[PDB]
Paper text:
Calcium homeostasis modulator 1 (CALHM1) is a voltage-dependent channel involved in neuromodulation and gustatory signaling. CALHM1 is the recently identified member of a large-pore channel that permeates ions, including Ca2+, Na+, K+, and Cl−, and small molecules, such as ATP, in a voltage-dependent manner. Furthermore, the ATP efflux through the CALHM1 channel in type II gustatory cells and the subsequent purinergic signaling has been shown to facilitate the perception of sweet, bitter, and umami taste sensations.
The single-particle cryo-EM on hCALHM1I109W∆ct in the presence of RuR showed oblong density consistent with the size of RuR in the central pore surrounded by the NTHs. The resolution of the cryo-EM map is lower around the NTHs and pore region compared to the TMDs, possibly suggesting a number of subtly different binding modes within this binding pocket since the pore diameter is large. Nevertheless, the cryo-EM density is of sufficient quality for the placement of RuR molecule, although an atomic-resolution pose cannot be determined from these data. The RuR molecule is positioned to plug the pore through associations with the NTHs. To validate this structural observation, we mutated the pore-lining residues proximal to RuR to arginine (Gln10Arg, Gln13Arg, and Gln16Arg) and assessed RuR-mediated channel blockade by patch-clamp electrophysiology. We reasoned that arginine residues that face the pore of the channel, being positively charged and bulkier than glutamine, would disfavor binding of the positively charged RuR and decrease the extent of channel blockade. Indeed, the Gln10Arg, Gln13Arg, and Gln16Arg mutants all decreased the extent of channel blockade to different extents. Thus, the experiments above validated our structural observation that RuR binds and plugs the central pore formed by the NTHs. Our hCALHM1 structure shows that NTHs are positioned approximately orthogonal to the membrane plane and that RuR binds to the pore generated by the NTHs from the eight subunits.
Author numbering:
A (entry chain G), B (entry chain F), C (entry chain H), D (entry chain E), E (entry chain A), F (entry chain B), ...: 1 to 262
The structure:
């Protein structure tokens, strides 16, 4: 099971060449790996499955999203100037709208890797649709020998839980699995395809790439840096002149000498 | 079992990029790992469980909290100036109230990782509510064949202790477990979700972020640095002039020469 | 199974000598390895195979292609100046046609390694043509003992799925496999041969290597570098003169002194 | 068993950021690990246990304490000036009392880790109170079938020694153990809690933190450094002028030439 | 199986001392290792073997050859000036003939290591001549008990495929193998001997080592270096004077000020 | 089997202190190790052995010898000036005879380690003289019960091939082996002794150590270094003045400007 | 078996602090380890043992001795000036006698470690005196039941060869061994004791430590260094003036220009 995460492990061990997305690589690479040690096991009960599996395609994604906004050091400047009234805003809506949108496209670089990499291994999908398999399809001389609706859902639904499987009635194990891990791995490619193709279009066309506001932004965020870095200079400077008055008082103020004079 | 902690192990091995929270990463990453080597095993007795399990969601958290306050080098300055009377305080309540609050939000970065990572593996939860499972639910032709209340609590309660399990009466093992590790992993996500979302709000709104007092603080804590660093200069300086009087006395004072003169 | 990817692992661990193709080595080396942890298992059903196997020679290649264009920092400059009308284009078609073509030959350095390295292990090919093996050829006293067409496709088609194989009727297992992994490894060499030989011809002849336009290009892309790097200078410069007016206001504006004066 | 010590092993391998306590980390981290290779096995005899177990909670702690005082380079200066008569002491009782107390709180950082980490694994506690377990409690249809007092102590007392356990009379093995490793791990937390909370109070209040004597101390210990470092200068200086008189005598004093002159 | 390649692995790990051949060591060392992970398994059918084995002594060699020419950065200069007409060639045939020949003797340093290291392990040779072994030689009381020609080729030919071997008729397994891995390892030495001895003669005598043309060559290839390296200087220089006109326009052209003036 | 080569592995890993012999350590240390992965297995047939074993004490040595001459960068200078006629030789026979002899004593540092380290493990010797063991010596009640000459050579000769050994007739296995690995390890010491003792004599006496010609040599080989290193200076110098005429033509020759002028 | 040598392995891996003896540590540490991979197995025949075992306490020691003299770079200077006649010797007998003796005490630092470390494991001693064990001593109801002298030597002598041991007649195996590995390990300590104690005396007293000749020696050996290092200066200097005359001839002598002039 180490394969899905040990790969980025040496890849992390490989080099130190990246960007903000590589800074996102600090987190989401763990998201490529955090799946590995976090186990998965479904109740194999009659109706809980379709509830439970939807838990592991919506919450842990949404967590990794919101942990992207708070993680970067900008949201205050947008949060601060939004709550204030219009007019008083020292920034145009344009620089707001852009700079707000350039937070999403650095955060989304995670909640898409953790929806691929829990489809390609199918576990998330297996416990979610096993209740409705066409049992007549490849059923070893099938025909549903008088089987009812209840007490068959409890027959099908165990399929992922291996050692507690009921038996050969209208199914083997290795044909009900290994046919739901096929259909799953079809979505996993026909999903990641559509997303990356939609990564094309975005850059390639447009949405708030105006040469005007891009300039004002990068100027501004560059300006906050020099402000913080420079304020410390005056403090340490202005403080240095102030310590000399007091520290000297400790000297010449205990005994004006040492008793250890030989 | 190494997975839950070996992950941060190479992640620790990964790089050296962090902050005070990464300084908290020095500790709490161990808290992500300290769970790994510290075993867990419940009494599997009739009433001790619900006592014992609550031991491992309140004490070891609270320890990691208080080890956060004492660990950082500020509490004296707050502790010193609080015990003194008002008025004599060389600092406003504002700089107090802020600087005191900026100790919590650097300490809490632990006692939340050690409440997630002992819910997602369910062991802490399993030995805490096994005494009340609906045995009729998925009970292999159930009906409670005349079973009493006592001598059934001692029947259910063994469920986590594997090799000492009684038997198939109104239960298998792999259906009483693997249904309490489902419910548990639901809280683990629906908890960590709520917390991180509440990490949003805090930064994003406010609570003592006033531009006034933030300035006075960082100036002040910057000032203590130069004071300590500079005091050593005068000492080593003022001492150097003093050693010369005595060290010379050792010379010219033993024999004023060596007998080894050839 | 680690062999196919652990090789580039220490090879990655080996040194840091490469180029843009070695920059492509950042990705496609993973493509040499990403095969390793991504499992493969075919439905072993009557008609799905020839559908499913074609999934793993066209989609995951095409993904690695498009992830090559978006990955490098040029497509905007081509995308921007293409959408505009002719005439307004500040660049000749020649520099366009070349610079556009020099994106392909840096991207193709992947989708050819992931078509070799899933033929040489034959798994991709095995589940794709097992339905039509000449069963009379090496069939252990063959003759097709009255076998029909249906209920034989479901007999042959299981061949890759080992533990669910039907039996010795007109076949053993280790002669239907180990004869489709021969034919496969013949394409894998007679393919990689043809490609590399076609790598010869390209460099060796020509296609838009004109001394004229190559010059204009590398000059231009060199020019964008100095533009971005130099703009930051004026900002940090022009900003530094501006901070001094405000930062001083924070000083001398809170109390013009400290109450901590002893 | 490597877990309890292999953790600090990579943690030691982790980085080199610490202080005098981290200098104590040089020793006590071994004390976190020295437990690992030093085995434990109790006599499983009738009365020796409660003697023997108390051996491994008082001696090996007390050793690690005294190895803390001697390890640091200060005790002579306190030991030297204590044996002398009062009055002649070149240092106030205050600087004595403080500097003596600042030896304990750097030594205690060990003999508390080696009392936790031999309670949390319970072995030290198991062989110490097995002689008095309530056998009627969870005793598999108990009632003490005429059992005497002697020849039952020799029945209970074997409990830790696994392969030499007598048998099922009024006990199984896995219920007499796994109920004394519960009670133990309760002290281990309710102990380490109380200690760390008492680490709070100490810093937070007071005990000889007077601004007066802290100054005189750190000045003094700073002064001993420059004295030792500077004495070597005069020696190597004063010696250099002295060697020239003799070393020249070796020259011009063997033959005033070489016979190897060609 | 790691031995044949793990050797160069630490040897690669050993040091970084080599030349262009060591640059070829970048590739062919993999060719010493690429054999390791690329499996080998022959059809064990009647006539395909002698076809199939010849596949693995001619194609994968020839690939590693052509990947040597294209890999080095010279063939264009030879390819460019060859297609042109004579007379216009700015270089003598001598510098052509030499410089063309000094491409082979740096490429051949591979396709000879991958013909040794797939003879010394004999697998390539075993599946190629098993069809004609003298069965009477060491045949355990032989005499060919009426065996025909067909249905014996299918008897011999299985010999490498272990678990599918027919049986003891006129052969054991461990005497038909372990006599074809002897004859093979004789060629492997009597081949590598002849080649290295022919490496002697080449250097030691001659073939286009003329002092005249060697000079002109190394001068020329040295000249191309300074040309490319120096062209970038004029560009970045000539460009720097050009950016200042436009970048200033962005300044003073958005608002000529900031609205954030307090 | 890793022991014979894993030793030099960490020894190689040990340090980087050596000379030309240590440069030979680059190769022959592999020769100490190349034995490890190159297997050994003898035909166990009647007459081939004494042929085959002599293959592995003469060819692989002789290869490692000739790979020593070609490996060092001197043979051309000797090869070049030998083919020429006497008189024209710019070097005395003395400097020739010495410098030629100082190639052997740096090459022999291999083909002696690969004759020891395939005697001390005896495998090379076992398959070479098993055909003539005195079977009466330690033969478990011997007497040769009417055994003929043929059909006994095929009885003895199998002795190294373990699982195909015939049986107890006039021999066990572990007394025919373990008496030919004794005699072998006697030569291995009484050989390496004689060689190293002959390493004494050589240095210690003489053979072309004349102070005259040693001087001329090391001067000469020192001179070739400065010649090659210095020639590159004039080229890069003389070329630099030449590029400026052409590179400027590319500028001012495409458009004398850019169309991108805004 | 790795223990005897893996120890110095990490000890070698430990640090790089040593001297000429540590330079001897380069070799003899291998001698501490070379025992590990070099196997040992005695003939277990009637009279060869006492011959064979003496082979492994005299030859491999004596080899490591002579490999110490030749290894260091001094013996020529002693060998050269000894063969010459007295009087012509440019060095006194004293500097000879000392400098010759200071070769032994750096060589002996090996052939004593390889006589300890093949006694403490007893294998060398076991196969050397098993022929004469007092069989009556601890002989399981002994009395020598009519056993003869011959056909008992062949009974005792097998004792080290485990699987070929005859049987229980007048002996078990684990009492004839495990009583000859006791007596052996007694010599191993009572030997290494005597040697190290004799290392005391040597330094502590005397043997050619005269202040006169020690001076002349270290001066002399210091002088040879500067001679060799300085000779290279004049060569490279005197050569540099000489190359300029010829290298210029290559220029201006091929064509006095290039045909590539455009």
């Amino acid at each position: 099971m180490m394969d899905k995460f040990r790969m980025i492990f040496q890849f992390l061990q490989s080099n130190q060449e990246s960007f903000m997305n590589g800074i996102c690589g600090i987190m989401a690479l763990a998201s490529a790996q955090m799946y590995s040690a976090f186990d998965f096991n479904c109740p194999c009960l009659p109706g809980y499955n379709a509830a439970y599996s939807a838990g592991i395609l919506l919450a842990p994604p949404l967590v990794l999203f919101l942990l992207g906004l708070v993680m970067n050091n900008n949201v205050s400047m947008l949060a601060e100037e939004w709550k204030r009234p219009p007019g008083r805003r020292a920034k145009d809506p344009a620089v707001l709208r852009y700079m707000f949108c350039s937070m999403a496209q650095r955060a989304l670089w995670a909640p898409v890797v953790w929806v691929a990499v829990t489809l390609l291994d199918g576990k998330c999908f297996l416990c979610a649709f096993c209740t409705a398999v066409p049992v007549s399809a490849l059923g070893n001389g099938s025909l549903a020998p008088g089987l009812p609706a209840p007490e068959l859902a409890r027959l099908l639904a165990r399929v992922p839980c291996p050692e507690i499987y009921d038996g050969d009635w209208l199914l083997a194990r290795e044909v009900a699995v290994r046919y739901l891990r096929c259909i799953s791995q079809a979505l996993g490619w026909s999903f990641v395809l559509l997303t990356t193709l939609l990564a094309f279009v975005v850059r390639s066309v447009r949405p708030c790439f105006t040469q005007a506001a891009f300039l004002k932004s990068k100027y501004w965020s560059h300006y906050i840096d020099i402000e913080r870095k420079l304020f410390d200079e005056t403090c340490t400077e202005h403080a240095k002149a102030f310590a000399k008055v007091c520290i000297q008082q400790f000297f010449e103020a205990m005994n004006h000498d040492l008793e250890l004079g030989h």
